[PDB]
Amino acid sequence: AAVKTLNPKAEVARAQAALAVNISAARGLQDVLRTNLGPKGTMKMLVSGAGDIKLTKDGNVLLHEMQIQHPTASLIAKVATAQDDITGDGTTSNVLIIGELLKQADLYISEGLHPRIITEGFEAAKEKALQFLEEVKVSREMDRETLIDVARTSLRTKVHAELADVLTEAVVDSILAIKKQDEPIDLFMIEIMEMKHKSETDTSLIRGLVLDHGARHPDMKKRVEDAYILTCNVSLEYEKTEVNSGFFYKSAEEREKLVKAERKFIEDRVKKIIELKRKVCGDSDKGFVVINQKGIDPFSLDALSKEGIVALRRAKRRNMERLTLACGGVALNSFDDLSPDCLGHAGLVYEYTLGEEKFTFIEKCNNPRSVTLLIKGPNKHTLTQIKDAVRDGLRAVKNAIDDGCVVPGAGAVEVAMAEALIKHKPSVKGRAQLGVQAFADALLIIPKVLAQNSGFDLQETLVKIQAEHSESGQLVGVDLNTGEPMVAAEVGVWDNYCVKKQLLHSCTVIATNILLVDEIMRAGM
Amino acid sequence: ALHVPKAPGFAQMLKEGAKHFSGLEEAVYRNIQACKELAQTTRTAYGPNGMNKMVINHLEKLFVTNDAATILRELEVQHPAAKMIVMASHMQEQEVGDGTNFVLVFAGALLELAEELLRIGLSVSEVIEGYEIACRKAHEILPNLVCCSAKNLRDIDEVSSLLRTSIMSKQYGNEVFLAKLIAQACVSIFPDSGHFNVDNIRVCKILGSGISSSSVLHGMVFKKETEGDVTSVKDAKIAVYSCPFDGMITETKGTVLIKTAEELMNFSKGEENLMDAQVKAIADTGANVVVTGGKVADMALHYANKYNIMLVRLNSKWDLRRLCKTVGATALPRLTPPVLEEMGHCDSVYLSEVGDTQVVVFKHEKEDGAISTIVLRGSTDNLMDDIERAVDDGVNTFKVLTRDKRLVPGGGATEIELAKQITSYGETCPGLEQYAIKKFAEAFEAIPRALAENSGVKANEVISKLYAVHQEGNKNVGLDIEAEVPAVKDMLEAGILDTYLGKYWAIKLATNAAVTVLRVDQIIMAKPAGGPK
Amino acid sequence: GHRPVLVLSQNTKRESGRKVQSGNINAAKTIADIIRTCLGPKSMMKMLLDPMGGIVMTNDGNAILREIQVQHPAAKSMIEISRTQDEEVGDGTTSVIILAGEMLSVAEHFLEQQMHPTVVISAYRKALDDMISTLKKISIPVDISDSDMMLNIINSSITTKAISRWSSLACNIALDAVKMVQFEENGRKEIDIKKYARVEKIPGGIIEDSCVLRGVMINKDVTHPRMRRYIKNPRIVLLDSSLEYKKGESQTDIEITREEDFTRILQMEEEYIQQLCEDIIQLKPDVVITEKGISDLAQHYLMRANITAIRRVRKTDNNRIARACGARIVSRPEELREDDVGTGAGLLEIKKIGDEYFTFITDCKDPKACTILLRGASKEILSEVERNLQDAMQVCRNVLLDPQLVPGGGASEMAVAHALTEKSKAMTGVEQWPYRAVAQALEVIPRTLIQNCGASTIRLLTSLRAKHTQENCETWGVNGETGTLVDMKELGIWEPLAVKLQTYKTAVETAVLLLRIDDIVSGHKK
Ligand SMILES: Nc1ncnc2c1ncn2[C@@H]1O[C@H](COP(=O)(O)OP(=O)(O)O)[C@@H](O)[C@H]1O
Ligand SMILES: Nc1ncnc2c1ncn2[C@@H]1O[C@H](COP(=O)(O)OP(=O)(O)O)[C@@H](O)[C@H]1O
Ligand SMILES: Nc1ncnc2c1ncn2[C@@H]1O[C@H](COP(=O)(O)OP(=O)(O)O)[C@@H](O)[C@H]1O
Ligand SMILES: [Mg+2]
Ligand SMILES: [Mg+2]
Ligand SMILES: [Mg+2]
């Protein structure tokens, strides 16, 4: 080879070798990820180099955690990473469709066909398929029932049935809580907090915040009923001068005076806080909670606790916005002009201790625009799996709300798309009809994998579903319990329209680019 | 994303050390490059102005020569395509005896132009077909290019003039003297019967006195000595014995069974008397020279000395057979005295010293016989070896002339005429084969180009002049060696001629090798492993 | 003992003669053969494995050549000329390499035929001059006011890349970006797309959604959540100095003896920050953008005046914002002027894409800087799209500066070859043969196009050569998609004159450079 002649220690795969290598890698990835698809899939168990246990079913997590060192695998992993980053679902379907597109293209390339014609057919089929998908989408008013159905169709595929049922209500209620009319949904306003002391079905939604840190002074009250929240970002600990001050004294009395006088700056702000608390609530019935993004030294903690004030230090940066939206106050960076109108309100604040860790609950808010999801489980891997599942569910519900439409699932949409592509194939001139047929066959992979995961066979189930679709014209999918054709619209098996569109676009682009690769080099050394 | 795996299928199933080159660029171009490299190494030894090359083989033996076949033999060529080219060269050497460098040069030019044709869009099959058509055209044309014939081989001056050109490429400075020597040696051989035996010419290399002192001896010369005391005979009566010069013994097992004292006392006396009787019976036939192929017994030597018999012990059977041929005797299987028909005769046998080497000479006064010997002198072993190679080339040229007497002009004249005629023919035939035919014609330019390059002149001027002259019609004109400026002159008058069979076989073998190399598409080389021999 | 004594140091090799020339020419031919198949509209793509673990799936010749490592110095020279061609004009990188390889290949013949390299070099230079004359002769003018012609030129430039599927959108984006970047000040015209035409790649979405913004987009968010994330008609103020309290350059130390000096010093730090914020506010801006940190207390004083603050932008991003919104970066807020206030941005929106916040200063009126937001399947796809966009913008700039055009698809190559042969028919010296050899070696571009198209080289090239011998056939090339000879007045494939001039000059000069070279010496330490 020319490259090996120029660089002796270089690896080269050229002409049919590059296609063979890429298609073999894609087929291996597809074979690994077949068992993930559908709720009837098999959980994969991942052990890291440090012995950490990872129980998961996601395509993206599996791709990241497989010990794979292949270039084509890296490309497909990046594609799935983008898929997860933007839409949050469809990574397994992404890998399956890419692999099946490559396999169907090879089925014709091995008979002397050129990949360029296959790519042209792929482009035409993708255009027609996007048109059909636009035609078939169901524009619906996203009420609570439809969102529950979408969240179910995600979570059941991700986790156990009862856990999915709980997470559906949790995710849908959280999204409806934070959502503002005609305003983009900000998913940063949903805390995903982990606790490790109860069963997995104890995961719930708190209409407020849960903080992983509690009061650092034992004398502070552990439970405040009616609380006023002061969200601040002001340092309440001793701070040294920027210009290297140092102290100079000539006796012990002057040293005592300077010690007493070096606390005055922080004491002024503590006095301001205490005066505000005294003015706002003159009785002991109401409470006062101070949440600070910066540290609070023990002197200030004692001064505050002597006034019946609960003070939390070193809060998270996003917790400022979370508390501002939920409790309803103003995040303060300085106490120059602080008024009772900048105080948030919480209907209940209490501290929960779990082992060596302490938590603070802020509930009973008036109208919390930011809420938290409390993930509870007996194991760490259970918590991680539930976090992944709730991420997928939140993404699915957000996509369903954003795009007012939704697409029938259970494999119906791609069956209809393949049938439409076959009907449209004669309209394509030249030999791009072979590429169109390959694209349709690749689109048909999802019902096949669903049938295998349900325990059925590809041929019988697929021909039954296609015959039912052709005879009736409805969107018939795969019934994973019986295998008979079934219309996903009534049963509530829904898929995100954006997810399907992204799947089509990304899969077609990456398959076309891979098919046109004819030479692989590693000669940078 | 840091390693490229081997493609599934044949790439993975390939053995550990094996190699697989497939396709045009990976295989055909590489083979053409290797053949071009081999031709480049051998090129600078072409023509009278070719420079000698000192090659040291794996056994530390030193070869200095400008013979292409010898250089290829002493070079450990590894590339298979160059190996096939070397095989073609050796086949040309075996078939004719001269034209090996022509074979390499033509094969290299053909393969290089084939690479050019493949690069400009032609296919391998079309190039091969065009080359075959052009080779057939050249073979048809060649008989029409004959300028003169041998027309006599019993002459000395004419044969020397004919053989001068063949031994002018080697030993350019002094070729007339070598031509005379080889002509005399060959004319001694080659009786009225048309058959000529190349092996009948013997070369003896004796160091010391420079090659100008070489001579031709009508007989055999052996670098040996005489067992007995007699060292010269003037009326030689050689008796040849393949058996050892001793009393024959049984083949199972000889046990002297003694049972009485009288037998023990008489055994040695009887054995000696028997051996004496046998030797005297041999001598009574008039034989005075005895040549034996085996060990000489002490008693046999003593009794041969007593009867004045010259003893020579030729150890090798080939020398014994050649002496039988040259003297006219038959190798007897036993020690019986020879009969008149088996009796060997020679004009003179004597022991002589040449330089510091003791030799035994079987000399015929007549300028005839079955075997003739060329005594080569020199100041270096390598010089004598090169002179012997030149002698072999001249003898092979004489053999070719005996087979076919037609001659064609040399010095690139025949090559230029063939190129012009093939170019003219190729401009008439339409189709994609015209490019291949034109390239085949152009490949003949490498011969005058090599001659001009070795002569120190500009090759392009010589080629243009040759085309012009052949365009007027002088088809016997080649480049002039004795000229600093690029110049051309007639070859028929200068006596620079090439054998027709040499050109015919060289062209055929070169084009066959080029076509065979082109036909190869894939190369599957195994692990080299060992194989020292 | 008795260590060997010798003139040069060890590990110092030296080879000379025909071997060096043959090796150099073979190295150049190998470099050419590496990317020979990546030329034309039907070129295949290559996957290159970065030693740092990355993957570069690309069709551009320059990226392929710069991502590989070679040991032969002639290959290094070839890679250097490829980089030079890429930097000077933007495209034509895989054409100049092929041309140089072919020229050296045809020079090897004359080197082997007892011709001194200097004669070959003189013939090469005469041929290059005549090529320049012929290209200047056969060019056609182009009016830059016609948008359709510019779009067609950019399309012809990008038909050979992977973006030809969305060619229309790509051409519109490139043309708009080049028009926006174009600037003139003090009578010095400037089209600087390497600084003020930024390409941002955000994986995901669809490629059809990529567009060029009338402004600048950065990956930044407000310092404090109370700040507005949507302002209708902001007044931009740019800074490149910290809004914090920092130590001075001179070594300074305080000495506190009175009790109230510590608190006084801290209060004066706060008052200094307040004074800086008040100086900023006196101009009444809507947003403040700084390249250095902004203190939390400064954030409080800025929010008190209802001002959005972006904390730490890069120097280049700040320059782009200044060019787009018409602001002027200042360091000391005490010296702020109304002229430095950036008015002209029609909208500042800070939205979230995926899981990250992005700041948009789009909707500017007469902006001199722009950002190209690229959305696609993955990182490598977006990298290749960015490379194609760079090629398109470079071609657009070349056409804007140099408004002549020459036919593409090898038509210019064949026309120049025919003119060179006609001129060589008149010479009588020995230099004519290398001259004609270069003339016919220029035919490698149509031959490579035919080879990549899959058609037969011999008869198609012969027919094209016969066609170019007529009176008016200078615009006859080949189809890279159908393998037929067509007039480029109909196909519409045209290339900038500057690109072809640079390609021919670089190829001929690389051939000259590698022809002059003999007696390679290697191994010596610095
Ligand atoms: N209850 C159900 N019955 C039938 N099909 C279902 C059901 N739930 C989900 N599916 C189908 O199974 C697929 C599940 O894919 P999934 O495992 O979520 O892959 P990804 O996580 O990559 O999206 C969906 O495409 C959906 O159409
Ligand atoms: N005196 C001469 N002048 C010109 N050419 C000569 C002369 N003698 C021999 N030649 C040429 O040299 C060639 C022989 O080259 P040589 O070294 O014998 O190669 P090979 O052994 O392969 O024939 C012949 O073709 C002949 O034309
Ligand atoms: N549609 C087409 N038909 C024929 N030739 C084309 C076409 N489009 C571009 N070309 C030719 O291909 C060349 C561009 O190939 P490209 O891969 O861009 O090489 P480079 O990167 O060196 O410019 C141009 O010289 C042009 O003449
Ligand atoms: Mg999913
Ligand atoms: Mg010879
Ligand atoms: Mg280009």
mmCIF file of C-alpha atoms in Angstrom, chain A residues 2-3 5-9 22 70-72 74-75 78-79 82-86 114-116 120 123 126 130 185-188 233 238-249 257-258 261-265 268-269 294 317-318 320-321 330-334 336-337 391 395 501-502 505-506 509-510 513-525, chain C residues 27 30-31 33-34 37-38 41-51 53 55 57 64 67-72 75 162 165-166 202-208 221 223-226 229 245-247 252-260 262-263 265-267 269-270 274 296-297 299-301 303-304 311 352-357 375-381:
data_model
loop_
_atom_site.group_PDB
_atom_site.id
_atom_site.type_symbol
_atom_site.label_atom_id
_atom_site.label_comp_id
_atom_site.label_asym_id
_atom_site.label_seq_id
_atom_site.Cartn_x
_atom_site.Cartn_y
_atom_site.Cartn_z
ATOM 1 C CA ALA A 2 1.073 3.590 -0.633
ATOM 2 C CA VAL A 3 0.506 4.692 2.970
ATOM 3 C CA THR A 5 5.178 2.428 1.871
ATOM 4 C CA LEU A 6 5.428 5.996 3.178
ATOM 5 C CA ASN A 7 4.777 5.080 6.830
ATOM 6 C CA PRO A 8 5.760 1.462 7.597
ATOM 7 C CA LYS A 9 3.959 1.304 10.965
ATOM 8 C CA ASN A 22 -17.512 -0.743 9.096
ATOM 9 C CA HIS A 70 -13.643 0.480 17.292
ATOM 10 C CA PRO A 71 -13.752 3.581 15.050
ATOM 11 C CA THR A 72 -17.185 2.913 13.543
ATOM 12 C CA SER A 74 -17.042 5.541 18.113
ATOM 13 C CA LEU A 75 -18.923 7.292 15.299
ATOM 14 C CA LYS A 78 -21.224 10.029 19.024
ATOM 15 C CA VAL A 79 -24.418 9.942 16.950
ATOM 16 C CA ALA A 82 -26.164 13.703 20.189
ATOM 17 C CA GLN A 83 -29.518 11.899 20.002
ATOM 18 C CA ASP A 84 -29.612 11.598 23.798
ATOM 19 C CA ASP A 85 -28.411 15.169 24.350
ATOM 20 C CA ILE A 86 -31.099 16.774 22.190
ATOM 21 C CA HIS A 114 -21.952 0.973 -6.258
ATOM 22 C CA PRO A 115 -22.602 2.624 -2.873
ATOM 23 C CA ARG A 116 -23.397 5.988 -4.495
ATOM 24 C CA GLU A 120 -29.125 8.362 -3.628
ATOM 25 C CA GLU A 123 -31.832 10.243 0.285
ATOM 26 C CA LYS A 126 -35.644 9.662 3.596
ATOM 27 C CA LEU A 130 -40.219 12.520 6.339
ATOM 28 C CA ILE A 185 -39.796 24.429 29.705
ATOM 29 C CA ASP A 186 -36.629 24.739 31.798
ATOM 30 C CA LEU A 187 -35.615 21.303 33.068
ATOM 31 C CA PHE A 188 -33.010 22.775 35.427
ATOM 32 C CA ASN A 233 -25.352 34.996 48.390
ATOM 33 C CA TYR A 238 -14.447 36.138 58.352
ATOM 34 C CA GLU A 239 -12.819 37.544 55.213
ATOM 35 C CA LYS A 240 -9.268 38.860 55.071
ATOM 36 C CA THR A 241 -8.401 42.181 53.474
ATOM 37 C CA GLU A 242 -7.182 42.050 49.871
ATOM 38 C CA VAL A 243 -4.225 44.348 50.605
ATOM 39 C CA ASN A 244 -2.374 42.364 53.307
ATOM 40 C CA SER A 245 -3.423 44.372 56.358
ATOM 41 C CA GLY A 246 -1.921 42.711 59.421
ATOM 42 C CA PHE A 247 -2.349 44.048 62.962
ATOM 43 C CA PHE A 248 0.058 45.991 65.177
ATOM 44 C CA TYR A 249 -0.495 46.393 68.920
ATOM 45 C CA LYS A 257 -9.666 45.506 71.270
ATOM 46 C CA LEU A 258 -8.450 44.607 67.777
ATOM 47 C CA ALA A 261 -13.052 45.141 66.301
ATOM 48 C CA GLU A 262 -12.091 42.768 63.470
ATOM 49 C CA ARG A 263 -15.496 41.033 63.582
ATOM 50 C CA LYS A 264 -17.495 44.234 63.087
ATOM 51 C CA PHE A 265 -17.928 43.940 59.310
ATOM 52 C CA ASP A 268 -23.050 44.413 60.820
ATOM 53 C CA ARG A 269 -24.611 42.112 58.219
ATOM 54 C CA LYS A 294 -21.337 31.070 50.871
ATOM 55 C CA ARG A 317 -25.578 27.752 42.804
ATOM 56 C CA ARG A 318 -28.757 26.697 40.985
ATOM 57 C CA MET A 320 -30.713 30.256 44.307
ATOM 58 C CA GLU A 321 -32.970 30.238 41.243
ATOM 59 C CA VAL A 330 -35.370 37.483 45.830
ATOM 60 C CA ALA A 331 -31.833 36.108 45.755
ATOM 61 C CA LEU A 332 -29.670 38.745 47.442
ATOM 62 C CA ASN A 333 -25.989 39.333 46.711
ATOM 63 C CA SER A 334 -25.716 42.054 49.377
ATOM 64 C CA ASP A 336 -27.383 46.987 51.392
ATOM 65 C CA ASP A 337 -31.155 47.569 51.123
ATOM 66 C CA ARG A 391 -34.457 11.712 32.832
ATOM 67 C CA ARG A 395 -37.357 14.483 28.150
ATOM 68 C CA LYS A 501 -37.605 12.924 12.910
ATOM 69 C CA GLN A 502 -34.175 13.055 14.557
ATOM 70 C CA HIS A 505 -32.252 12.441 9.804
ATOM 71 C CA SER A 506 -29.285 11.234 11.857
ATOM 72 C CA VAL A 509 -26.857 10.982 7.310
ATOM 73 C CA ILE A 510 -24.490 8.678 9.190
ATOM 74 C CA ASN A 513 -21.436 8.958 5.124
ATOM 75 C CA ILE A 514 -20.255 5.521 6.279
ATOM 76 C CA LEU A 515 -21.249 3.810 3.024
ATOM 77 C CA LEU A 516 -19.158 6.325 1.066
ATOM 78 C CA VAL A 517 -16.047 5.685 3.183
ATOM 79 C CA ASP A 518 -13.671 3.609 1.063
ATOM 80 C CA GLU A 519 -10.360 3.874 2.925
ATOM 81 C CA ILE A 520 -9.361 3.877 6.608
ATOM 82 C CA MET A 521 -5.971 5.127 7.800
ATOM 83 C CA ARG A 522 -4.076 5.277 11.086
ATOM 84 C CA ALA A 523 -0.824 7.022 10.175
ATOM 85 C CA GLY A 524 -0.496 9.960 12.558
ATOM 86 C CA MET A 525 2.357 8.403 14.540
ATOM 87 C CA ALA C 27 7.664 9.865 -2.822
ATOM 88 C CA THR C 30 2.966 8.167 -3.582
ATOM 89 C CA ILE C 31 1.660 11.375 -2.001
ATOM 90 C CA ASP C 33 -1.705 8.418 -5.207
ATOM 91 C CA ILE C 34 -2.840 8.673 -1.581
ATOM 92 C CA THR C 37 -9.348 9.076 -5.617
ATOM 93 C CA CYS C 38 -10.667 12.061 -3.607
ATOM 94 C CA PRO C 41 -18.024 15.292 -7.587
ATOM 95 C CA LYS C 42 -18.014 11.479 -7.274
ATOM 96 C CA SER C 43 -15.132 11.335 -4.795
ATOM 97 C CA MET C 44 -15.194 8.803 -1.972
ATOM 98 C CA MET C 45 -14.607 9.801 1.640
ATOM 99 C CA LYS C 46 -11.770 8.689 3.905
ATOM 100 C CA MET C 47 -11.668 7.920 7.624
ATOM 101 C CA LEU C 48 -8.502 8.975 9.459
ATOM 102 C CA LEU C 49 -7.642 7.905 13.007
ATOM 103 C CA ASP C 50 -6.226 10.761 15.065
ATOM 104 C CA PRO C 51 -3.457 9.590 17.438
ATOM 105 C CA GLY C 53 -8.194 9.066 19.623
ATOM 106 C CA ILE C 55 -11.710 10.424 13.946
ATOM 107 C CA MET C 57 -14.019 11.465 8.240
ATOM 108 C CA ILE C 64 -6.090 14.069 4.817
ATOM 109 C CA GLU C 67 -3.417 14.148 9.380
ATOM 110 C CA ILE C 68 -0.812 11.624 8.158
ATOM 111 C CA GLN C 69 2.843 11.363 9.164
ATOM 112 C CA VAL C 70 5.662 10.736 6.685
ATOM 113 C CA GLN C 71 9.407 10.228 6.992
ATOM 114 C CA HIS C 72 10.611 10.941 3.457
ATOM 115 C CA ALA C 75 6.570 13.799 1.105
ATOM 116 C CA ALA C 162 -20.572 15.990 1.187
ATOM 117 C CA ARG C 165 -27.192 17.543 -0.782
ATOM 118 C CA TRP C 166 -27.994 20.869 0.922
ATOM 119 C CA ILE C 202 -23.964 22.065 18.215
ATOM 120 C CA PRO C 203 -24.530 18.317 17.700
ATOM 121 C CA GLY C 204 -28.146 17.292 17.255
ATOM 122 C CA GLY C 205 -31.072 18.795 15.453
ATOM 123 C CA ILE C 206 -31.134 18.605 11.671
ATOM 124 C CA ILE C 207 -28.723 20.001 9.098
ATOM 125 C CA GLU C 208 -31.607 21.814 7.396
ATOM 126 C CA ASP C 221 -25.361 32.559 30.598
ATOM 127 C CA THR C 223 -24.257 35.590 36.142
ATOM 128 C CA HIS C 224 -27.374 35.847 38.314
ATOM 129 C CA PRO C 225 -30.781 34.274 37.574
ATOM 130 C CA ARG C 226 -32.646 37.497 38.409
ATOM 131 C CA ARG C 229 -32.853 36.535 29.626
ATOM 132 C CA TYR C 245 -11.387 44.554 43.722
ATOM 133 C CA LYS C 246 -7.807 43.478 43.050
ATOM 134 C CA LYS C 247 -4.306 44.138 44.325
ATOM 135 C CA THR C 252 1.646 47.551 49.145
ATOM 136 C CA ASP C 253 0.998 46.689 52.790
ATOM 137 C CA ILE C 254 -1.305 48.242 55.358
ATOM 138 C CA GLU C 255 -0.525 48.699 59.054
ATOM 139 C CA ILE C 256 -3.639 48.703 61.235
ATOM 140 C CA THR C 257 -3.432 50.152 64.742
ATOM 141 C CA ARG C 258 -6.809 51.831 65.248
ATOM 142 C CA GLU C 259 -9.782 49.575 65.906
ATOM 143 C CA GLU C 260 -12.009 50.850 63.088
ATOM 144 C CA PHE C 262 -10.270 47.089 59.204
ATOM 145 C CA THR C 263 -13.979 47.760 58.718
ATOM 146 C CA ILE C 265 -10.926 49.236 54.507
ATOM 147 C CA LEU C 266 -13.602 46.641 53.754
ATOM 148 C CA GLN C 267 -16.234 49.366 53.371
ATOM 149 C CA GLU C 269 -13.553 48.079 48.903
ATOM 150 C CA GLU C 270 -17.343 47.864 48.691
ATOM 151 C CA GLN C 274 -20.128 50.593 43.876
ATOM 152 C CA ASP C 296 -21.134 39.181 43.177
ATOM 153 C CA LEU C 297 -21.509 42.608 44.796
ATOM 154 C CA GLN C 299 -23.681 41.845 40.099
ATOM 155 C CA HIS C 300 -26.006 43.133 42.823
ATOM 156 C CA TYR C 301 -25.354 46.756 41.889
ATOM 157 C CA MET C 303 -29.190 44.153 38.896
ATOM 158 C CA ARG C 304 -30.278 47.151 40.972
ATOM 159 C CA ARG C 311 -19.257 37.149 33.120
ATOM 160 C CA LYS C 352 -31.298 26.774 26.096
ATOM 161 C CA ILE C 353 -30.225 24.312 23.398
ATOM 162 C CA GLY C 354 -30.072 20.738 24.621
ATOM 163 C CA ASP C 355 -28.812 21.034 28.202
ATOM 164 C CA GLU C 356 -26.754 24.232 27.847
ATOM 165 C CA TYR C 357 -27.502 27.949 27.781
ATOM 166 C CA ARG C 375 -26.610 21.524 13.712
ATOM 167 C CA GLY C 376 -26.161 17.964 12.551
ATOM 168 C CA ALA C 377 -25.955 14.277 13.317
ATOM 169 C CA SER C 378 -22.734 14.226 15.346
ATOM 170 C CA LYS C 379 -19.373 15.915 15.871
ATOM 171 C CA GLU C 380 -17.548 14.532 12.821
ATOM 172 C CA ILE C 381 -20.413 15.353 10.456
#
